[PDB]
């Protein structure tokens, strides 16, 4: 009773819905912003698009809602729909690639002397620079800048919790990636009067090892038929034609591979590294098989009286066997041996190279997890 | 000039949902017209389209002719949507999607009570293009639209030219073309047996298409293909013995290519419309290509195999010579190529005929509807 109807009344009589919990132009209302992440569902590492979900915990004080006996001293804590406070119509300078879901228009926790607690989980369409640099083992970092899209920091100050909180705090276990750390730094670019956005850093690490495995098999298994086509010559010289069949076959195979590679990066591309040199490794088996094909080509051919008849017989046979013996002199196997071992150098050299680069790529550019 | 009082006077009596109908037995005079401006999606196989239509809306309601303070002030007024009779438009046969930006827009109230309004609308519809619209003779797109709310005994729509156009702003990036747009103003009585006519707006659109890009992708390959098979056909007379199978390699290659085509453009017609006439010449000129093609191997299949002590022994050896000769003789009576050579000219003129039958007829199915 104690002026309850009265209080109650006066409050709703004088209280202003559309007003800011501050008095004039000054230090403003110090709103607390801090989100406990739920998990993330889709990383479009290719366009640098980020759809995650977290809690929008906001909290500041409404010294305009401090109650009295019944709602203050009666029930120190009571729930009341928002819709009555300035809400950070927050957009993300890079990210905020789309609207809020479970972000605004939801109830809030209002304390006795005016404290306000609003904890809503939400899904948000963002876009961070995971750029086409989300695959190097050295990976990269990003700028996630949150802030309102009609308000300018003049009638409120934004403030954070931790900066180490981490993003693996609610990292998706469903992620083909992994994370090292999440930096959180408060910002106010001076290119705009409006103090604004906060930059949040993603020192992301995404190592999904699954198909590069059977990709290796081509390179090496194709090599099987490759070393084979380079081995088949002094193995079965008649490989002559069958050889060409091999490369038709070998080339179509690698071209189909050419088919799956562009359409697969089509959703998760970054530096060429792997492709850069396998591209070379490609060109390598490609041309090596084709010049060996020219190795194959280079051969212009390969690619008394009684006794007289006898004598005429003696000369017939012998005469042309030298001729076909000439073909021997012409297609001997010197090259095959020499370049099948130049094949030895080439393929085992260029092989242990990307082997190496790849080797160097996973270990060397790994520690910049920062 | 009573400016305030007048506004306040009518608004007193101002009636929303009531039509400016003098009385109830002669309806109101409603004017409408549409200027196409965007034909956004042509999915003819399903007979649907999306267009930005200028919904020219006009009618009469002197319920607000004004005085010196509003009529005379300016013979022109722009008053909000929600403030006068509004035709909830839709295309009987087409509009399959509620109008977008076609309503809730500023209307126009001159001074005598003339009302003009014209919102732009992107919406979905379903015109003809029913197993036809892909010819050279075109199916006239007939869209009739009217208010879907009341029926002509209170409402009456007007129109204008039924002779003059859809190509007024027909899109230049369309894979088609328009040649005429007729439009009639009419009463309501359909196949379904509905009475009390609510007048509507008929939209004829007989348009052309077929600006083939795929044509010569189809025309040069087939000639290359025909020649390839005619290679198969004449190449044998030129080709060595190791060519029978040579020819085969081509059949394999020839149809690998073939059904791959059969898979390529069939896809084409499913994502877009469809029609069988042009379809008939291809697959059957194609099946004949295949026919005489396998016929060829069955042709390079046909034939049986082409697919004193001194003298006693001189006697018998002179026999292996004549003996084997009888054998090589076999080859003779078997491979005297009357059928093959002639098979070249067989397919040749047959080629000319299949071609003439087809391109001559393609000449016709472009020339009757020309």
């Amino acid at each position: 009773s104690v002026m309850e109807d009265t209080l109650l009344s006066v409050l709703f009589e004088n209280y202003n819905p559309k007003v800011r919990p501050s008095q004039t132009v000054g230090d403003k209302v110090t709103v607390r912003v801090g989100l406990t992440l739920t998990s993330l569902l889709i990383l479009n590492e290719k366009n640098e698009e980020m759809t995650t979900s977290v809690f929008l915990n906001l909290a500041w004080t409404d010294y305009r809602l401090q109650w009295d006996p019944a709602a203050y001293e009666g029930i120190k804590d009571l729930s009341i729909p928002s819709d009555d406070v300035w809400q950070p119509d927050i957009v993300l300078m890079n990210n905020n690639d789309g609207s809020f879901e479970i972000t605004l228009h939801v109830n809030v926790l209002v304390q006795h002397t005016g404290a306000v607690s609003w904890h809503p989980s939400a899904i948000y369409r963002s876009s961070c620079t995971i750029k086409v640099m989300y695959f190097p083992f050295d990976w990269q970092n990003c700028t996630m800048v949150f802030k309102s899209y009609t308000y300018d920091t003049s009638e409120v100050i934004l403030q954070h919790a931790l900066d180490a909180m981490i993003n693996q705090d609610a990292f998706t276990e469903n992620g083909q990636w992994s994370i090292e750390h999440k930096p959180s730094r408060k910002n106010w670019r001076s290119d705009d009067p409006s103090y604004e956005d906060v930059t949040f850093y993603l020192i992301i690490q995404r190592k999904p090892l699954f198909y590069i495995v059977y990709t290796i098999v081509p390179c090496i298994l194709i090599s099987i038929l490759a070393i084979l086509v380079f081995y088949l010559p002094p193995d079965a010289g008649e490989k002559m034609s069958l050889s060409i069949s091999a490369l038709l076959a070998l080339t179509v195979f690698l071209l189909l591979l050419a088919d799956k590679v562009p359409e697969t990066s089509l959703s998760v591309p970054i530096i060429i590294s792997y492709l850069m040199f396998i591209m070379i490794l490609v060109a390598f088996s490609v041309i090596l098989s084709v010049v060996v094909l020219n190795l194959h080509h280079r051969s212009p051919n390969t690619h008394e009286a009684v006794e007289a008849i006898k004598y005429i017989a003696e000369q017939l046979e012998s005469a042309s066997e030298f001729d076909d013996l000439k073909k021997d002199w012409q297609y001997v196997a010197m090259v095959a041996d020499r370049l099948f071992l130049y094949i030895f150098i080439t393929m085992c050299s260029i092989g242990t190279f990307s082997i190496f680069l790849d080797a160097s790529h996973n270990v060397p550019p790994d520690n910049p997890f920062a | 000039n009573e400016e305030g009082r007048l506004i306040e006077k009518l608004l007193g009596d101002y009636d929303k949902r009531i039509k400016p109908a003098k009385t109830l037995d002669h309806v109101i005079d409603v004017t409408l017209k549409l200027t196409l401006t965007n034909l956004i999606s042509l999915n003819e196989k399903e007979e649907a389209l999306t267009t930005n239509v200028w919904i020219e809306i006009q009618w009469n309601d002197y319920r607000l002719s004004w005085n010196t303070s509003e009529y005379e002030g300016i013979d022109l007024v722009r008053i909000p949507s929600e403030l006068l009779w509004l035709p909830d438009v839709v295309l009987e046969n087409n509009v399959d999607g509620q109008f977008e930006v076609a309503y809730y827009a500023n209307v126009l109230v001159y001074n005598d009570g003339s009302m003009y309004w014209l919102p732009p609308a992107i919406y979905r519809s379903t015109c003809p293009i029913a197993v036809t619209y892909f010819p050279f003779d075109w199916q006239n797109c007939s869209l009739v639209f009217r208010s879907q709310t009341y029926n002509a005994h209170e409402v009456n729509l007007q129109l204008s030219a039924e002779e003059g156009i859809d190509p007024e702003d027909f899109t230049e990036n369309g894979e088609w073309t328009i040649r005429h747009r007729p439009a009639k103003k009419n009463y309501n009585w359909q196949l379904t047996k509905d009475d009390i006519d609510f007048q509507e707006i008929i939209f004829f659109l007989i348009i052309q298409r077929k600006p083939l890009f795929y044509i010569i992708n189809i025309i040069a390959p087939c000639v290359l293909i025909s020649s390839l098979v005619v290679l198969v056909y004449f190449l044998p007379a030129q080709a060595g013995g190791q060519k029978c199978t040579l020819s085969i390699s081509v059949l394999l290659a020839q149809t690998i290519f073939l059904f791959l085509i059969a898979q390529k453009v069939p896809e084409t017609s499913l994502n877009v419309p469809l029609i069988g006439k042009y379809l008939i010449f291809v697959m059957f000129v194609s099946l004949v290509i295949v026919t005489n093609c396998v016929i060829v191997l069955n042709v390079s299949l046909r034939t049986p195999n082409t697919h004193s002590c001194v003298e006693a022994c001189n006697f018998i050896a002179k026999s292996t010579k004549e003996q084997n000769d009888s054998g090589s003789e076999n080859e003779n009576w078997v491979l005297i190529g009357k059928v093959i050579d002639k098979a070249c000219f067989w397919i040749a003129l047959l080629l000319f005929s299949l071609g003439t039958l087809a391109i001559f007829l393609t000449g016709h199915l472009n020339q009757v509807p020309e």
Partner: protein, 369 residues
Amino acid sequence: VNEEERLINDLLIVNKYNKHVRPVKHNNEVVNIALSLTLSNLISLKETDETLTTNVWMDHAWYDHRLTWNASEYSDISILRLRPELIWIPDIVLQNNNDGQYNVAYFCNVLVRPNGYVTWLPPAIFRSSCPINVLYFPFDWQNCSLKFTALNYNANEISMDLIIDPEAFTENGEWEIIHKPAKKNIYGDKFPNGTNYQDVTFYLIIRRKPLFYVINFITPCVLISFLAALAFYLPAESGEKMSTAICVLLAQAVFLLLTSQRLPETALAVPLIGKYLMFIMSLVTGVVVNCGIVLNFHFRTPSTHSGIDSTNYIVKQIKEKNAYDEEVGNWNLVGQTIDRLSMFIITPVMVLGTIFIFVMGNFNRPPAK
């Protein structure tokens, strides 16, 4: 008329009743709210990303003490309707599966009992991120956990107490629903200094996998395998089909490669385990290897891959001489090795082929354990 005008004026739902005020008889323990979960349908499953679109009947109950009516409300009709904006509605949040706001399970017509008890239960088209993990593929196919409850209120403003999942499991799913337990609870946490919001915890333990991919996929293996199997039987019946035998490698090779290509395609659409994916590609490689083996083994050998008297002696010389050539080749032929090859192809096919369905079983036995 029995005080009706006056009484609903007494309730005035919106005006007299505090709809923005939840009747929890003021600050105390809580309003006894209860949630009931019944899946009406499961339309889509995404095993790979642990996401599910499913329909639920959001059966809700709580007593609205200000809702109790009198004769011209209560007894006039011991049951009547009143919209959401005129009925207190729990703010049920799909705790770990509402990362996709609820549809038409929102502000819907509710049922008004006579003595305040109210009943609101409409349809929920929802999306969830259930505990798939890369362990939602072994035969147990995990247990999908979900919690439901009134999000906003705590343990002194709300108490929610507590149906099979296959009750409306979708029959067009690529999986199988084995069980679905239901038990409510309430729980505080470390950073919170007080207990609150009670919830409906419903675990769905399921299983899935086709008996169809097995069909057309192993099918080609015994068919293809017989080619590679015959491959070694064929080197005997006629190894002279050198080039043509070579053709078949190209051909059995191109077949092999994109077959594996279709594999990841459906793969990405499905998080496949490492245990199974290897037996597939391991064994096709078994043939791939033996195709390469086919190569060499099929082309592996170095070669197989007195005057009148004077003159004819010349020929008997040329005779014998190239007879040595002729034979230098059969030296290479290696034919008494033939059967052993295809015998030691049989043995291994038996070894590995068995090794697989041997392993098939050694893991087929323990789950059935």
